[PDB]
Write a protein that binds this ligand. Sequence first.
Ligand SMILES: c1ccc(-c2[nH]c3ccccc3c2Cn2ccnc2)cc1
Ligand SMILES: c1ccc(-c2[nH]c3ccccc3c2Cn2ccnc2)cc1
Ligand SMILES: [Ca+2]
Ligand SMILES: [Ca+2]
Lengths: 175, 175
Amino acid sequence: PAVHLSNGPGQEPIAVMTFDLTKITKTSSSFEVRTWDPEGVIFYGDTNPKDDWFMLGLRDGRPEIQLHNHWAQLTVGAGPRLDDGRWHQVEVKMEGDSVLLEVDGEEVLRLRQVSGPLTSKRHPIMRIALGGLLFPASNLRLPLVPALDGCLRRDSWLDKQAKISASAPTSLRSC
Amino acid sequence: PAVHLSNGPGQEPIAVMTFDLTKITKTSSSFEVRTWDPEGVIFYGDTNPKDDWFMLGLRDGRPEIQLHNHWAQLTVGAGPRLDDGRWHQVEVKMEGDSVLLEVDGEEVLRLRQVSGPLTSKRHPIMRIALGGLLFPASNLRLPLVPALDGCLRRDSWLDKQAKISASAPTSLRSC
Ligand SMILES: c1ccc(-c2[nH]c3ccccc3c2Cn2ccnc2)cc1
Ligand SMILES: c1ccc(-c2[nH]c3ccccc3c2Cn2ccnc2)cc1
Ligand SMILES: [Ca+2]
Ligand SMILES: [Ca+2]
């Protein structure tokens, strides 16, 4: 059962979830995606949309990560083209101080020294948005057009035991 | 005709070249490498070893780039394992504000927004060192042991028309 990653012309995400970082023990997510679209947002996350945020998307058909926090600020593309209309397995893992991206079972990117332990300075509420950003696309380090005409399935996001809230699922469209 | 990327126990590079950045028109390099060694430095470059430097190497058999300048500071791993004893084609290209890494004809990494135009503030003399760093390994963002027991061939470095000096080639060892 797959859901569309874009619902109409607007750039708003199709789903938002909120997590308690003080309770999280699983810092990875996994999903399958299929698209003919070379550009868009797969997911966005933040503890503060001004000061601590990240984005996984596609640009020129390839994975792109942008992130901005006090440890690191970067815009990186990596991995194979995903816009070939086949299902691809994606996993994003925060391990130690590093973020790992795996595509179809292969590690394609490791961003080192981009994260740290949870400090009382870090706001302990993390949002995850699917298919869109929680700020205007112009606040990205490198703007793109967020709409991603693709399908998502088999998706697991961080640690369900730490989830505080999730948007209503009746706004979702089956593929 | 290939040359060894490590000459003895010391960590010093096997070759150094110097370029005039005011004259450079080709900002890419290409080479083939073969190694069973999972860790080490392939090349290092700088305009200032304190303030503006970069490194391409291997860690856990995979390409790693570290760079440190006023625009960007990062430590990133990407691409396939290269420590399988086969020759691999590598190309590193500075294009616009981005650095591209290609391995065996495939783009595996694009670091965006890491470079800018040549400004009078930027020291216009760039050094490139092969097989070692031009500072102690402890000054890396993430230390590694620089020695890379591998072989290098078919190597072209930046723009030979901008080259000011190059170390003596009789210190090189054939593979
Ligand atoms: C690009 C850049 C950073 C991240 C990121 N920052 C994090 C901060 C805290 C916990 C997990 C993560 C993840 C990993 N993550 C987030 C949702 N699913 C996995 C993710 C993608
Ligand atoms: C990792 C990070 C940065 C770079 C880099 N910074 C540069 C600054 C000015 C011109 C070319 C380059 C290159 C590209 N380059 C340098 C030698 N051969 C190609 C290279 C590797
Ligand atoms: Ca799109
Ligand atoms: Ca080594």
